[PDB]
Amino acid sequence: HIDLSALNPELVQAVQHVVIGPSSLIVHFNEVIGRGHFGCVYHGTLLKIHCAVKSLNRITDIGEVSQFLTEGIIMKDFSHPNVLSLLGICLRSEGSPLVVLPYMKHGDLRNFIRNETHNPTVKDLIGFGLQVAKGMKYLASKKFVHRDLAARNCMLDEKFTVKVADFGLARDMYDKEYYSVHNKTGAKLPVKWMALESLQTQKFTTKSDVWSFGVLLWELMTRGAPPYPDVNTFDITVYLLQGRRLLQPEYCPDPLYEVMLKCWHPKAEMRPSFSELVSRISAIFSTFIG
């Protein structure tokens, strides 16, 4: 049940634009197309546009419904070609709401670059990085901190447009291997993507997203290799503090590696902005043919 009185009164108008009438959405529960810790995702058809419908029923309780709606309202206002959009929220009598996302033909960026059937060039891979940078520039301009930027958490549509995903109501752990339980707080953290200061404080900033972006670039240029494989979970802080960074991949251009090292600057405030990353990467990208 939607209680409009409960919402911040300035957001009540926005509710009609986020909520999808059950009549307008058909969900195909017959086959699961995706799995998160919080629930499965299914094909869906919205009024005929193909969408990805995520259930949240694997969570015991959804939380404050007023907050869930507020999250949707905030998320639906985001619009950028390199950011996954929210089409809406559909309310079903039996169970939690369905999250309705655009269908992403080519799945997550990490699996796409790991796939033997596709053969992106070095230029293509740098271009995926640039697209991610533009999406993050947008999110950062909205004062939004992602907290979990990685190749696994970006997706590709049918035109190979890369969209930063896994945020707001689509937030989940979509590959459990890469999340380790903190011993004091119990938080499951993507430690191998995290900045030094975040490993220490568990506080995340746009500048810690910049660190994660550095890692994502490394993933692109290794076509999805796991970072720091011979390091175990929270021993990553000790490893980094020995004076270490991910090594330059064979086909990573030198200036792109220099960008990665700037993304991993020990002082968060000295890391480049996403605007700067877009600028520097666009230049590098422009030097390539094919």
Ligand X SMILES: COCCOc1cnc2ccc([C@H](C)c3nnc4c(F)cc(-c5cc(C)no5)cn34)cc2c1
Comparison of 190 and 272: residue with beta carbon closer to ligand X: 190
Tell me which residue has its CB nearest to ligand X. 107
Closest approach of Cβ 95 to ligand X, in Å? 16
Closest approach of Cβ 258 to ligand X, in Å? 28
The strand pair at 19-20 and 88-90 is best described as parallel
- Which residues are part of a known binding site for ATP? 33-41, 54
Comparison of 75 and 125: residue with beta carbon closer to ligand X: 75
- Which residues are part of a known binding site? 33-41, 54
Closest approach of Cβ 217 to ligand X, in Å? 17
Contacts to ligand X by CB under 6 A: 33-34, 41, 52, 54, 84, 101, 103-104, 107-108, 111, 152-153, 155, 165-166, 170, 174-175
Comparison of 54 and 134: residue with beta carbon closer to ligand X: 54
Closest approach of Cβ 170 to ligand X, in Å? 4
- Euclidean distance between CA atoms 46 and 33, whole angstroms: 17
Q: Which of 148, 166, 172, 209 is catalytic?
A: 148
Comparison of 118 and 244: residue with beta carbon closer to ligand X: 118
User: Is 166 designated active site?
Assistant: no
Residues annotated as part of the active site: 148
